[PDB]
């Protein structure tokens, strides 16, 4: 039931990714071409992580991945 | 958390013969390894998400980067997709990066996540053609990298400053709309929960607050009103180590405090508090103490008055973990 539920999440998130999908202004590309360290409100939503919370970053980079990403193939994680 | 439901832990295979220098991008015996064994089979991804030191020189950064670059091409087939993470900053020459990117790759695209802080120059580079087809010494290569053009370099920073605004604009949207709702959560935090992770604030209050529970309004009260009498009573009894220790200890207290409060009943002893919070910073005062009833007694309050008000400041590794227990009590508690 575990692994239904997942696969049931899985399946219902796709018109819209978890309310994380992205917008134009976000993505750019090189050929068709100030803030300040201190600051720290993004944490506030960082709240699902003992050891890393870095995992919310995955989930937006998420629709990109299954858009140009073979399924098929193997994967390799540097760092 | 899941009980090997989908058998993760069986599908981690980590690259490692035992010497500590084969683990490092830069050296060439991890480039050595992973060719080794990784030549037989068929990657599709490989994403690198770099430590982002602040000690390391540009020159380290574009090494490192090149190195990627030739293990991707090493033991990357073909459709084979290269992500990867920068942190440009104000210097000038920091565009090499960029030109590198575009020299080795034919479809590079940037992007603003809004997940990620909105304060800082973090992006994220997607590749996925390969281009060149001669491999070459990182000297030659890094002595052979150049700025790019003015004018796609001002368009890119008015790009990253108008995407970081906007990002900035939908977090605090989001953190409002998140601390007025019911008790729902976000549908990013219940698929997170779905896959398994779980809740860090009562972690992040054990290890940091020393609170067993933050629930518990009762025994965190008697928790401070014990603090406080035995710092007053040290504090008078007089060291440098000792008074930070104690004052440490205090803010700690106060801190459990505002946190489980603001979980019960659903507003901060003191409104100023998060403010301060967020410059990074936490003050505690007389007016602070006469403010909420029967916390303390007329003498704590005229032994306080003694020091008047105490401000810690910590470091951004605790800043964000004061982040982090803060929009747990505001995410999680009663509206």
């Known amino acids: 039931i575990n692994d239904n539920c997942n696969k049931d999440n899985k399946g219902n998130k796709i018109n819209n990714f978890w309310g994380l999908a992205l917008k134009n202004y976000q993505v750019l590309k090189i050929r068709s071409i100030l803030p300040q360290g201190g600051n720290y409100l993004s944490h506030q939503l960082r709240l699902f992580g003992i050891n890393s919370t870095s995992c919310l970053k995955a989930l937006e980079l998420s629709q990109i991945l299954m858009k140009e990403v073979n399924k098929d193939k193997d994967r390799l994680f540097l760092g | ?335």
């Open chain 2, 1 to 335: 958390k899941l009980g090997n439901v989908t058998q993760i832990l069986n599908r981690v295979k980590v690259l490692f013969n035992g010497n500590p220098n084969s683990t490092w991008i830069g050296n060439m015996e991890c480039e050595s390894l992973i060719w080794s064994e990784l030549n037989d089979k068929s990657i599709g991804l490989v994403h690198c998400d770099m430590e982002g030191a602040i000690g390391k020189s540009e020159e380290t950064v574009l090494h490192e980067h090149y190195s990627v670059i030739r293990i991707t091409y090493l033991i990357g087939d073909d459709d084979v997709v290269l992500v990867s993470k920068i942190i440009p900053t104000i210097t000038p020459n920091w565009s090499r990066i960029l030109y590198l990117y575009k020299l080795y790759w034919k479809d590079v695209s940037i992007i603003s996540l809004k997940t990620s802080n909105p304060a800082s120059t973090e992006l994220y580079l997607i590749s996925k053609d390969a281009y060149c087809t001669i491999m070459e010494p990182s000297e030659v290569v890094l002595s052979k990298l150049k700025r790019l053009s003015l004018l796609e370099e001002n368009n890119l920073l008015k790009w990253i400053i108008l995407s970081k605004k906007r990002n900035n604009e939908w977090l605090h949207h989001e953190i409002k709309e998140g601390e007025r709702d019911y008790g729902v959560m976000r549908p990013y935090h219940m698929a997170l929960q779905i896959f398994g992770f779980q809740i860090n604030l009562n972690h992040l209050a054990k290890e940091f607050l020393s609170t067993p529970d933050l629930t518990n309004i009762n025994n965190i009260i008697q928790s401070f009103q014990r603090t406080i009498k035995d710092v007053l009573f040290e504090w008078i009894n007089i060291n440098k180590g000792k008074l930070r220790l104690l004052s440490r200890r205090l803010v700690l207290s106060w801190i459990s405090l505002s946190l489980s409060t603001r979980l019960l009943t659903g507003r901060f002893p003191d409104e100023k508090f998060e403010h301060r919070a967020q410059t990074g910073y936490v003050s505690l005062a007389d007016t602070d103490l006469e403010s909420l009833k029967l916390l303390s007694k007329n003498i704590i309050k005229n032994y306080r008055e003694c020091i008047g008000s105490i401000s810690y400041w910590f470091l951004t590794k605790e800043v964000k973990i004061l982040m982090k227990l803060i929009g747990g009590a505001k995410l999680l508690g009663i509206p």
